[PDB]
Amino acid sequence: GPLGSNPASLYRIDLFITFTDELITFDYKVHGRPVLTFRIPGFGLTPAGRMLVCMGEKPAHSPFTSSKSLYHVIFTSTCNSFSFTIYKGRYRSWKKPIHDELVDRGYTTFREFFKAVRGYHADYYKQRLIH
Ligand SMILES: [Br-]
């Protein structure tokens, strides 16, 4: 396959969303460390419900309990493109994302990119425990 990708500029954030009945956790990571973490009271969700939370939508709640599940949301941007991609479980190169979106916008500074990334879940950030 291709020997590599060489984007002239690349900003990336990996958002790990952990679903449990008691808490849902949002971990924004760069270079393997959280740069922002927040948590909301958990609720039951269907698989489509979890994807909608990953998209930043408000899904219907379910009364049913479930076991812990990890979703991996990847934001990347060049100066002229922005990608939004959602995996059930962790990213793998062989794994098909459950949602993949490409925006013809890009970002020239990381601060603007990070602000744009946060906006996807801003309504959940309003619901955070430590407020
Ligand atoms: Br919090």
Numbering used by the authors: -4 to 126
Please share excerpts from the published article on this structure:
Secondly, the viral 2A protein is required as a trans-activator of frameshifting in cells and in vitro which permits temporally controlled, variable-efficiency frameshifting related to the amount of 2A protein in the cell during infection. Despite highly divergent sequences within cardioviruses, the TMEV 2A protein adopts the second known occurrence of the beta-shell fold.
The asymmetric unit of the cubic cell contained a single copy of 2A, which was refined to 1.9 Å resolution. Interpretable electron density was visible for 2A residues 1–126, with a short G-4P-3L-2G-1S0 N-terminal extension that resulted from 3C protease cleavage of the GST tag. The structure of TMEV 2A reveals a globular β3αβ3α fold, with a similar ‘beta-shell’ architecture to EMCV 2A (Cα backbone RMSD of 2.65 Å over 130 residues). An extensive curved antiparallel six-stranded beta sheet packs against two alpha helices on the concave surface of the sheet, whilst the loops between adjacent beta strands project from the opposite convex face. At physiological pH the protein will thus have a positive electrostatic surface potential across the convex face of the beta sheet, surrounding loops and the N-terminal end of helix α1, suggesting a putative RNA-binding surface.
